[PDB]
Symmetry: D2
Subunit: 330 residues, 4 copies
């Protein structure tokens, strides 16, 4: 009959609330509850059979690697149940883009996985959450959503969990992808215009089932006058890979290169990403000799997605050439 | 007559690839301001052109001293009766930081245009020749006076305030969240909008009174972040920290305590974000700015907020004033 | 104390009610139309003293040139009153860009005129009209909105009435300008980032006070294999000016320049616009010899917006050279 | 084993030339094929290239007969053992219309790339050289087969189906609401997305069975519009009319009557819109299409909806089949 969709709540704005309606700021993060939430969008009942669970109650900006492994596992066990057709995950928008890419890489299932958040507090005037949630259930419950990877359904759009990023603050169309949306959801109905071209879910070489721990990976920012300080400090603190958020085409200040070649020698992966995030990508051997130094380029991945790919890739290889290949297919 | 335009060369516009089909991989900043004016003889149809090699740097490696040196030379030129507009050729990586710096400290109404190129000169369909020709067309036009520092790339007139390097590889790399001020076509300028923020002649900042810039650093926020870069940068003498937060300059709760402490010990805390295509960080929204005595960088991305703060701190350390500054420039 | 804002409804209700906002005796006793609109969003009262008036009852895709005139004339009367500090006009989104433009050119006033609409029906889940109307009022009552021209406040933005256009179907962010937003409006507060550089309201040479009738102006679309049929039918049915929605930089098919030249001769003004509407503009003498044939280029103006500038310019002149000048200053 | 690429020239600015290097206007396009290939000598490291001049037209004046001729020539080469890929140089005004036509009726998986220039080859920083290089690099690659007709301008690989000339003047003129499929940098292709709609080898339409195309015309909608253009076009023989409505393909109530009646009389009524940067037109939203027996153009702009209808009309006159096609291609 209808599909069986499970909602995993993890906190959010969605189920947040401010002092009021005119107040689309200052709101408290992860304020309500899953059963409470489902109960407020009774239309859901027309799309599918929905069950909800509260996995964690967090603010996405304070998320942890463990919260990620915990959510990763939980979805795996649900994906295996003969009586779960699709999964919607409620999440804070700050780090939605990281979780989404995390799940796209390690969830070896065909079943639609949908992450949704909201830009305005639920009690805010014209709050976006209702409709986003309605549409997330709409997509998780359609047989055509099967096999397209992790999906994000905000603002009437179907975005790929791999490359959508929080790019516009305050506004409802905050989530954008440099490669565009895969489709649109209008009145709970799905319209597809494009398909993913990168490895994910069912065709991924990674399995959450095989991950017990995630390695420590950190990010340093490049700008005029930057020094090697933040990089050596994160390495000294445990960073197993450093994501270099360079200016331009992943460029490294001349005052830092030496730091980076030494860190490399002492076994730290060096991944060149950039703070030029609306389009294009970082090219290998263009601004730095990646072959000579044994560094890796993050391709089109922004600093935070690149972090997600590396922590996961490093769960299986410590070979620069292998990581390069991986940044090139996922 | 004809405007007297001066090109200040600082060192891709000056880069050469190994080939014609090498539209990357190149050595940037290898050619002379003189061979640059001479490669484009049509310049002479717009104005009286003279150039100077102020420095030869790779922009991803610029330092505060190179900024102060370019800012003083520009001021000296702008004061001259014999200079109508100025053009600065610069590498694109940090062109956005230099363009805003100049907009804040050059109290002059003469046009200052900063231009670069996405492809090296030796490349097929190299964008540089037109960029320069247009930078000179804009600098030479009386209409350009008084609009702040301008960036003329990809046929557009952008504000040096909020234009940013947003797209890699493409010739349309430079965008602004509030759009272009106009376009430049066949050496003619077309205007559609005017700047609303304080700049140049209306700036309370003056290069002539700046002898040094305070050290300001940027720390990035992401899932599982720690206070490690924050503490280290400060320990290394950062006088203010730009926090490149997630969402509306949000702060990881395992980091808040270190920020409170740094603040207490005198480091300015400026909340910015890595949500840069549009929107802004709102005071007291994700964090009690009033209570912790922090500042919000408004719509400015992290490298821009650092530029405004180094310069604001040359005159004040009052976080109330730094906040008014973030709201007007 | 509070500014005085008048809301002029031109169609159906753009927003729904709320909590007690709807149950309240106030709401309940409120006479349908614009009175239930104001009563539903009680937070309005905290921005200004608001009053509504239903000036017309139209579907925006069916607006006529007499409807423009009437709204235009009523705005001028209101602006003139000492008792009116600002005006909000609720309007259908289909031709909102057309009215917004017309009011910018003919209302010689510095009091804020704000046009606002809604992409989702007042009854939909996550309906945007409520917050849009709350922000229109917030903008109409800020002394900082004065002398900025007609404003449109949708999707938390402050768009210029001149070049804002409905560019995306469905989405709440439908309205875009090639030159960007002027600012944003969040939690009732205004944030400005750009100023208009073109003529409008107070510096306009046109005045509704003085316009009694508008000239007939029509639009003809160009594409592969177009013929002169529609150009010739529109002129024969009374068009005084033809807006050519051309391909590229207002290019004209060689099979059509003949009809154009002859209509020109028999007095029809020929305005070369284009169907390339996300940016750039039409250059005089580039695709056609405008000088020789005595045609006008619509500069960056889309077809419907160029129709608006011409109906007006032609209230005052029929000189091709003057029209050109006006296309370049407004 | 170099791939074999055939370059078909049809005219337009890539082959253009003005009277000066400064001018990106007023120039004579479709002025110069051997000239084309000799000028980018590096093409030879990509593939074995041969060219032929098929027509020499100005794209804004193209006829349906020009489309069948081209479409027919492409099928003949696509069939030859000797052709691995095809590049077509075309003026940019109606390039989005020929790319889409070809996407629909060329039953082949061999790469078909349509390319143009925003600047004449005489201009400074002229875009055609690299564009051309890039077209041959994409047409030569194994990876391009089976993706539909592609457009390679501005370093992007755009889908021939929804790419549209959206920006005037600029080298970035060509955009799609659903984004680029990838990019080509240094003759190499990077793919980020795949087509989801029927095209080429999976289209039910075939240029070999098309010997003629139905007349299809477009009428524009705005405030105060009348039934005049609708009626004059139908009288003159349009078999389908594309309505470019305001909003969600909205119809003025003063026009509904001419439409219902034209429908009665046998013309197809396809509701498109002039809201072209995104979204689509919904069936039964603004008009009772079910009752009126009309069709909705989905996300297709006026000019694309016309290509699809004239083509669907070679197979069916059934409104419901037509609707289906509008939903799959």
């Amino acid at each position: 009959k209808l599909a069986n969709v499970v909602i995993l709540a993890t906190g959010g704005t969605i189920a947040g609330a401010g002092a009021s309606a005119a107040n689309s700021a200052t709101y408290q993060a992860a304020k309500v509850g899953v059963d409470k939430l489902i109960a407020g969008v009774p239309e859901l009942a027309d799309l599918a059979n929905v069950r909800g669970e509260q996995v964690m109650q967090i603010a996405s900006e304070s998320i942890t690697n463990d919260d990620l492994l915990k959510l990763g596992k939980r979805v795996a066990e649900l994906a295996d149940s003969n009586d779960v057709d699709g999964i919607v995950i409620t999440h804070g928008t700050d780090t939605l883009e990281e979780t989404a890419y995390f799940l796209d890489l390690t969830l070896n299932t065909d079943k639609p996985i949908v992450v949704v958040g909201s830009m305005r507090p639920g009690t805010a005037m014209s709050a976006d959450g209702m409709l986003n949630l309605y549409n997330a259930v709409a997509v998780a419950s359609n047989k055509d959503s099967r096999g397209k990877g992790v999906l994000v359904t905000m603002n009437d759009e179907i975005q790929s969990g791999r490359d959508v990023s929080k790019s516009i603050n305050i506004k409802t169309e905050a989530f954008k992808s440099a490669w565009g949306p895969l489709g649109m959801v209008v009145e709970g109905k799905s319209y597809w215009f494009r398909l993913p071209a990168k490895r994910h879910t069912v065709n991924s070489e990674f399995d959450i089932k095989q991950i017990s721990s995630l390695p420590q990976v950190d990010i340093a920012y490049s700008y005029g006058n930057v020094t090697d300080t933040a990089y050596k400090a994160l390495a000294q603190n445990g960073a197993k890979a450093l994501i270099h958020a360079g200016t331009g085409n992943g460029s490294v200040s001349s005052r830092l290169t030496p730091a980076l070649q030494t860190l490399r020698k002492t076994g730290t992966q060096i991944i060149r990403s950039s703070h030029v995030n609306q389009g294009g990508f970082v090219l290998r051997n263009a601004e730095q000799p990646d072959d000579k130094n044994d560094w890796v380029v993050a391709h089109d991945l922004n600093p935070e997605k690149a972090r997600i790919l590396v922590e996961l890739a490093m769960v299986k290889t410590q070979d620069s050439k292998e990581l390069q290949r991986i940044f090139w297919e996922y």
